[PDB]
Ligand binder design. Sequence first.
Ligand SMILES: CCNC(=O)[C@H]1O[C@@H](n2cnc3c(N)nc(I)nc32)[C@H](O)[C@@H]1O
Length: 215
Amino acid sequence: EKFAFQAEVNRMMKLIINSLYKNKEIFLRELISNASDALDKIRLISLTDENALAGNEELTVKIKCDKEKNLLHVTDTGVGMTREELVKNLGTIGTSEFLNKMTEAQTSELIGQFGVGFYSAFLVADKVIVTSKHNNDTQHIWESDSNEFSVIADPRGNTLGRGTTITLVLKEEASDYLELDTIKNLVKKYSQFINFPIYVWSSKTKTVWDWELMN
Ligand SMILES: CCNC(=O)[C@H]1O[C@@H](n2cnc3c(N)nc(I)nc32)[C@H](O)[C@@H]1O
């Protein structure tokens, strides 16, 4: 269940981290963008597949902060990833050209263009966990501290229905992303042009918690 990252991915992670150290908040923009892409994918599949949305009838992005556990969660009800996809799509990668472009650039816009924004999560996380459920497979968990990664069948079973949850164990210097005021402001900014509703789990005054629409 243990795997090593492809050399190119190791270099890419380092380039991204060294290039965006000044604007770490971009990680949320990238995770939201990826969630949107995943939702576009299942929507495209639903055009031809009548049972496509059976595992979860909604098309949304939901963000939750768990200050107590030092976790930030970004969940989408997109197409999800099979076990094989978790291993291949996150562990391997015009890569040589991009790597040269990044180096020749030192990148915010470039990263999104080449579709490697996911790795910016390491700008603010000591550990990145990806739980995913695809219609053609069972739920699995991918986890990595960037020095290796593992994939295991999720012992909780099918809790997502369909989709993916990106869970970030924040670095000590990234505790700000556990605060609602900050997350709501960033989510609002990065969700403006997303064509799917994005919600943040928040409080409202007793004190009641529920999903708050951000776009
Ligand atoms: C880390 C660089 N590679 C990726 O981010 C890829 O992993 C997969 N990925 C990342 N976030 C995802 C996400 N939220 N949903 C789905 I479906 N796939 C995702 C896609 O293939 C991305 O291009």
